[PDB]
Paper text:
The DNA repair factor [name] has a critical function in double-strand break (DSB) repair by homologous recombination, promoting the assembly of the repair apparatus at DNA ends and participating in DNA-end resection. An important mechanistic advance came from the demonstration that [name] exists in a tetrameric form, due to the presence of a short tetramerization motif at its helical N-terminus. The amino-terminal domain of [name] (NTD) is comprised of an N-terminal sequence (nNTD), responsible for [name] tetramerization, and a C-terminal coiled-coil sequence (cCTD) that includes a zinc-binding motif, with C89 and C92 as ligands. Our data show that [name] adopts an extended dimer-of-dimers structure, in agreement with a role in bridging distant sites on chromosomal DNA during the recombinational repair.
A double C89A, C92A mutant (Mut) [name]-cNTD protein was prepared, which crystallized readily and showed improved diffraction properties. We determined its crystal structure at 2.8 Å resolution by molecular replacement (MR), using as search templates two coiled-coil models comprising the strongly predicted coiled-coil regions flanking the zinc-binding motif. The crystal structure revealed that the cNTD region spanning residues 31–136 folds in a highly elongated dimer of uninterrupted parallel alpha helices. Within this helical structure, two coiled-coil regions—named here CC-N and CC-C—comprising amino acids V35 to L84 (CC-N) and I117 to L138 (CC-C), flank the zinc-binding site. The coiled-coil structure of both CC-N and CC-C follows largely the expected heptad-repeat pattern of interdigitating hydrophobic residues. The residues surrounding the positions of cysteines 89 and 92, comprising the zinc-binding motif, interrupt the coiled-coil conformation and form instead two alpha helices running parallel to each other in the dimer. Surprisingly, in the crystal structure, the alanine residues occupying the position of the zinc-binding cysteines 89 and 92 point outwardly towards the solvent, in a conformation that appears incompatible with the shared coordination of a zinc ion. The reason for this unexpected arrangement is unclear; it is possible that the presence of alpha helix-promoting alanine residues in the mutant protein had induced the formation of a local helical conformation, leading to the observed continuous alpha-helical structure for the entire [name]-cNTD sequence. Crystals were assigned to the trigonal P32 space group with unit cell dimensions: a = b = 86.6 Å, c = 42.6 Å, α = β = 90, γ = 120, with one protein dimer in the asymmetric unit.
Author numbering:
A (entry chain A): 30 to 141
B (entry chain B): 31 to 138
The structure:
């Protein structure tokens, strides 16, 4: 009757009011979880910047630092080569002046 | 009970409308939540792709320079031992000429 129908309606109003308390707080949780993901993406973007800065820095630095050593290694070799070339020329000149004198004495003994 | 039962059924339908609207806002927050989830996976995939380019770039520059240090020192040692061989050949020839000259000078 009138009492039962009013009782049934007041129950529906109470149950809906409790669900609205839960729904409003579920929205607040979704908002905080989304803002947490945004601040987490800020950190990941900073990490991407450091990696892209080290891709250009590591490529352009090692390309010039390794050339510094390839250059200085040949300079070491060229100094040794220059010392060896001076030895080769002095010995070749000393040998030629000696070998000419050997044929002069060898033909002198045969003619006599 | 006529103006009261009607007065409650309106409040029920108003509350149901507020829960339907909140259910739509929960769908909006949920879809925006999964979008940021997929964006983080992209950032994680991007970070891993860049970290792999580091390992590939370093192992390449470390192996290319090792090929240069190997072939350069192979050249310098082939040249140096070529000069050592030549210098010793000239020295032995100089010595054997001085011996023969001193022998021939005494023969006369």
């Amino acid at each position: 009757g009138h009492d039962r129908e009013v009782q049934g309606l007041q129950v529906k109003v109470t149950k809906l009011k409790q669900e609205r308390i839960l729904d409003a707080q579920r929205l607040e949780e979704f908002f905080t979880k989304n803002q947490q993901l945004r601040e987490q993406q800020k950190v990941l973007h900073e990490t991407i910047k450091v990696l892209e800065d080290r891709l250009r820095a590591g490529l352009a630095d090692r390309a010039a630092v390794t050339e510094e050593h390839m250059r200085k290694k040949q300079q070491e070799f060229e100094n040794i080569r220059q010392q060896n070339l001076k030895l080769i020329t002095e010995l070749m000149n000393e040998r030629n002046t000696l070998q000419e004198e050997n044929k002069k004495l060898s033909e002198q003994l045969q003619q006599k």
